[PDB]
Amino acid sequence: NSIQIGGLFPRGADQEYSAFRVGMVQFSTSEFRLTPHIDNLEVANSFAVTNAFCSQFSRGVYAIFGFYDKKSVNTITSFCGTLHVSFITPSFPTDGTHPFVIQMRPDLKGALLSLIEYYQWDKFAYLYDSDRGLSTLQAVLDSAAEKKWQVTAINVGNINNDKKDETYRSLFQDLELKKERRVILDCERDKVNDIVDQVITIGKHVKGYHYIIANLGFTDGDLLKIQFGGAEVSGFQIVDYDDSLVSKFIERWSTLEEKEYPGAHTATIKYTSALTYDAVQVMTEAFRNLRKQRIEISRRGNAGDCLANPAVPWGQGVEIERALKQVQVEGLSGNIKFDQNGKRINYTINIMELKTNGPRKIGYWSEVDKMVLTEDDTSGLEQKTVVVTTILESPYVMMKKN
Amino acid sequence: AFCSQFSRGVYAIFGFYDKKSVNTITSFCGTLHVSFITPSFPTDGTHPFVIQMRPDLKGALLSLIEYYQWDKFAYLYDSDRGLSTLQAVLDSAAEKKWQV
Amino acid sequence: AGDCLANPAVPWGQGVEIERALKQVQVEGLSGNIKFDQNGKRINYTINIM
Numbered sequence: 001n002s003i004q005i006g007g008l009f010p011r012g013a014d015q016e017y018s019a020f021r022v023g024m025v026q027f028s029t030s031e032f033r034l035t036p037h038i039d040n041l042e043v044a045n046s047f048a049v050t051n052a053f054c055s056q057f058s059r060g061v062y063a064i065f066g067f068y069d070k071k072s073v074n075t076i077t078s079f080c081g082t083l084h085v086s087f088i089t090p091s092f093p094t095d096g097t098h099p100f101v102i103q104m105r106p107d108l109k110g111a112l113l114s115l116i117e118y119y120q121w122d123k124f125a126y127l128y129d130s131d132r133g134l135s136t137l138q139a140v141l142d143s144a145a146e147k148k149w150q151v152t153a154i155n156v157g158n159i160n161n162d163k164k165d166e167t168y169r170s171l172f173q174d175l176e177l178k179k180e181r182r183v184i185l186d187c188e189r190d191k192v193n194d195i196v197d198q199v200i201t202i203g204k205h206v207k208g209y210h211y212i213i214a215n216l217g218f219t220d221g222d223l224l225k226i227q228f229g230g231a232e233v234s235g236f237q238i239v240d241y242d243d244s245l246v247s248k249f250i251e252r253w254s255t256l257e258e259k260e261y262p263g264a265h266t267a268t269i270k271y272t273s274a275l276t277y278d279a280v281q282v283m284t285e286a287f288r289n290l291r292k293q294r295i296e297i298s299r300r301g302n303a304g305d306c307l308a309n310p311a312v313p314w315g316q317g318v319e320i321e322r323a324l325k326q327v328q329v330e331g332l333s334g335n336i337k338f339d340q341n342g343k344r345i346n347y348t349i350n351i352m353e354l355k356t357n358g359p360r361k362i363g364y365w366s367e368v369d370k371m372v373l374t375e376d377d378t379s380g381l382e383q384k385t386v387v388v389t390t391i392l393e394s395p396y397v398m399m400k401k402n
Numbered sequence: 403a404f405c406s407q408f409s410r411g412v413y414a415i416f417g418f419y420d421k422k423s424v425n426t427i428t429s430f431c432g433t434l435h436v437s438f439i440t441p442s443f444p445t446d447g448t449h450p451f452v453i454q455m456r457p458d459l460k461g462a463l464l465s466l467i468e469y470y471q472w473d474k475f476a477y478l479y480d481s482d483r484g485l486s487t488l489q490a491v492l493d494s495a496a497e498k499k500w501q502v
Numbered sequence: 503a504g505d506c507l508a509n510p511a512v513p514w515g516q517g518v519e520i521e522r523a524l525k526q527v528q529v530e531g532l533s534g535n536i537k538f539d540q541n542g543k544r545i546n547y548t549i550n551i552m
């Protein structure tokens with residue numbers, strides 16, 4: 001009845017763990033129950049990730065739910081590829097087809113490339129952060145030569161937080177040499193709130209500018225500060241709060257005590273945490289299908305040292321790979337399904353434009369269909385003051401005597 | 403393999419690393435204080451206990467593109483070798499008016 | 503030395519003295535002048551342009 005799994009959590013991911021505990025209760029049946037082993041470690045320090053993964057492998061788990069950084073993603077994917085241990089993660093998908101990895105996050109590269117094609121953009125900025133892999137930068141650069149775009153890629157990541165006022169004021173001075181009015185922000189939801197505040201300081205948020213937040217949590221970050229400046233701000237949202245499924249989840253979420261569940265007494269939830277809740281439903285339904293298929297998975301004994309040479313992989317991991325990669329359930333991230341590689345398939349990302357009345361569901365895409373929502377007859381603002389410019393020269397435009 | 407040498411008790415490790423495996427060595431040697439001496443491409447950032455024989459080529463490439471007075475050119479790169487240098491010429495493409 | 507996944511991480515003392523000796527080496531070789539900074543990157547080096 002006790003199924004052992006390993007948890008690798010970043011120390012600063014409290015809400016991302018609060019959603020994990022809630023998922024344990026919602027999908028707990030009387031047939032069995034999952035037993036987590038949680039290790040809070042530094043996600044960037046890959047030696048700690050190596051020390052943590054091998055801790056769970058010595059305790060003999062069956063799957064591992066965790067995260068990884070750019071500095072540590074290869075450590076996870078290469079151990080799981082040899083030891084045939086299944087890894088479930090909400091971090092960015094691995095740049096390639098790696099077995100025994102269950103990537104809960106969908107691939108955003110297909111979204112951004114067509115949101116650009118929708119607005120008919122041919123020259124824009126792209127401030128990226130390498131903390132989540134250079135997968136998307138190679139996407140915009142490869143398609144920049146095919147469509148003959150004129151793109152400026154700036155590794156805004158490696159910047160110190162003490163000289164941030166003088167350097168951020170210096171980045172926009174370079175972008176002014178082409179008078180760039182179309183920017184794509186590709187940082188995590190933290191550094192975006194840093195750039196957003198520095199955009200307001202220099203006033204580059206009025207009529208004319210048009211930003212595109214490139215992460216799956218447009219509503220997660222704060223938008224009310226660049227809402228009324230007049231700049232059009234697009235984005236992407238994966239947690240559709242309109243669905244009655246999420247609204248059922250949000251209602252129970254908004255009421256839990258914040259001391260036992262940090263970062264949980266609000267009406268919204270970050271796309272990282274929401275994917276975590278939807279991960280438990282993947283794992284629970286994966287083992288339940290092993291039961292119904294009459295498959296025996298419990299370890300024959302001690303897995304031994306992960307550094308065993310030659311590395312002997314336990315065979316039942318393949319059945320766990322095929323069990324997790326063949327789950328198909330419905331959760332907060334909409335539809336959930338995986339291919340033979342563990343990548344998100346058959347999914348749906350909603351597109352969001354920020355207007356005067358707040359975030360507005362405008363569009364959506366799919367790995368088969370691109371930019372289909374037409375249209376948003378509901379909501380609407382019906383408020384548009386057209387800006388007309390002219391020059392003071394008689395008698396065309398003269399200031400009245402009074 | 404880094405552990406097969408620590409058990410044997412080496413006092414320093416000469417080797418190489420890839421784009422995918424560089425972070426494994428940099429953080430391992432950082433915690434276990436083993437000294438790594440390698441020619442493999444220099445660490446993107448300051449990682450202690452690593453000796454890079456490879457001199458920083460990216461600083462030399464920028465100076466060369468200036469002397470030739472280029473404005474628009476193609477840059478070919480393989481994601482296998484990496485792109486720490488292509489990143490360097492894409493960051494400096496706005497200040498110095500390059501259409502890469 | 504034992505295992506590399508030693509918990510807690512026991513860092514031997516003489517490793518920090520080895521790091522200091524390496525970067526303090528200043529000799530001449532096939533690459534030109536070889537001296538290092540406190541991080542381990544080449545300084546006072548020479549790249550020919552051909």
Ligand SMILES: *[C@@H]1O[C@H](CO)[C@@H](O)[C@H](O)[C@H]1NC(C)=O
Pocket residue numbers: 335337346
């Ligand atoms: C794809 O998603 C649709 C909509 O949820 C679902 O009805 C269908 O069964 C899925 N197809 C496959 C092959 O999983």
Ligand SMILES: *[C@@H]1O[C@H](CO)[C@@H](O)[C@H](O)[C@H]1NC(C)=O
Pocket residue numbers: 528534535546
């Ligand atoms: C710097 O390199 C030159 C060329 O090899 C050498 O003559 C000089 O002594 C070096 N500087 C120092 C401080 O050793």
